[PDB]
Design a protein around this ligand. Structure first.
Ligand code: NIO
Ligand code: NIO
Ligand code: CL
Ligand code: ZN
Ligand code: ZN
Lengths: 200, 199
């Protein structure tokens, strides 16, 4: 192609962000346009490349969470714990996924990052990854302007190389694409089309 | 009447392999009395202020080395993406912060939730250390495999371990005697879940 990126089984990790019914199904609280289209591509990357580790994330709010309009927050209720919408989408292939990590778990605070949670408090993701030798993390999924954005940014904050799989992501708001992209690039995240990836 | 108060800063709960195959009717590898645990683990999971709670999952490829069909001990069980591999619907996942899969490659097994049989780490240790876990509570199945080895590995990684003896069932009841001895002087504490209290 134009450039080659070798995926390493010792050193490269993959994060699959909020691929859940509530974000992806037509019915469902917070539908992200072009959400389901990503499945095809993500399923293939998880499938055919040999990452050291793979993590999918899960927005996992209580019935009465702070970020809901019913309690003063920006969003409609979504990804309530044990609700159908909170489940990972049936079209996702979890077979090569070593861990599911949950966020937004406490009534009082929201989390867009896969790394932090209840304020200062960690999810232990940064820890586990480091602990297992991972040096460079790839990110795909939803929402580009939220979970993907902050997860990629906290990964830099924690010392990882970050590569965002450009074509395997979608946003709540496309007007935010300019703003967010700049912020990513200037924080040293490298955006990249998945078709540039090859195995060892 | 000797209690154990559970901390929201240091104490972490591990629920071991509460999946369809070990538990449900027509599951391929049945742990006797495994379904009956569901009441108590749900209570411990929801009534206690653990820092963190982790559900493990046996998660095997369809041609796994540990299957009898390939010369291992066990019927095909917990195949990746199968009815059988799912966590039992009757377990309340609401207060679980993470699910960890194990026995994930064809060529290696892993009774422990800490390490695959070939030294590869699952990441569990680093996660628990990251959040500041200082002791782990273990419950689920199987007492004589997953639960035993997790306990021991938690002890190698330098965690205190309390084992909820009433919230476990074993694949094999006779083995119970040999495992508890090994756990006893592994420094592990055996405790009925009705000894746990909050803050
Ligand atoms: O993608 C996310 O992180 C997100 C977006 C809206 C609501 N909850 C989570
Ligand atoms: O107890 C376990 O984890 C176990 C037992 C048999 C087969 N696979 C896993
Ligand atoms: Cl490279
Ligand atoms: Zn949310
Ligand atoms: Zn097994």
């Amino acid at each position: 192609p134009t450039l080659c990126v070798t995926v390493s089984s010792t050193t490269d990790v993959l994060i699959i962000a909020d691929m859940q019914v509530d974000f992806l199904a037509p019915g469902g609280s917070l539908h992200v346009k072009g959400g389901e289209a990503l499945l095809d591509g993500i399923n293939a990357v998880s499938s055919q490349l040999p990452f050291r580790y793979q993590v999918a994330t899960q927005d996992w709010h209580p019935e009465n969470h702070c970020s809901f309009v019913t309690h003063g927050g920006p969003w409609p209720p979504h990804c309530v714990q044990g609700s159908a919408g909170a489940q990972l989408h049936a079209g996702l292939h979890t077979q090569r996924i070593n861990a599911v990590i949950r966020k937004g778990v406490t009534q009082q605070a929201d989390s867009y990052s896969a790394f932090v949670e209840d304020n200062g408090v960690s999810t232990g993701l940064a820890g586990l990854l480091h602990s297992i030798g991972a040096r460079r993390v790839f990110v795909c999924g939803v929402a580009y302007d939220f979970c993907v954005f902050f997860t990629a940014m906290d990964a830099r904050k924690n010392g990882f190389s970050v590569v965002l799989l450009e074509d395997l992501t979608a946003a709540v708001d496309d007007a935010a694409w300019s703003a967010r992209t700049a912020e990513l690039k200037d924080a040293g995240v490298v955006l990249l089309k998945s078709s540039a990836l090859v195995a060892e």
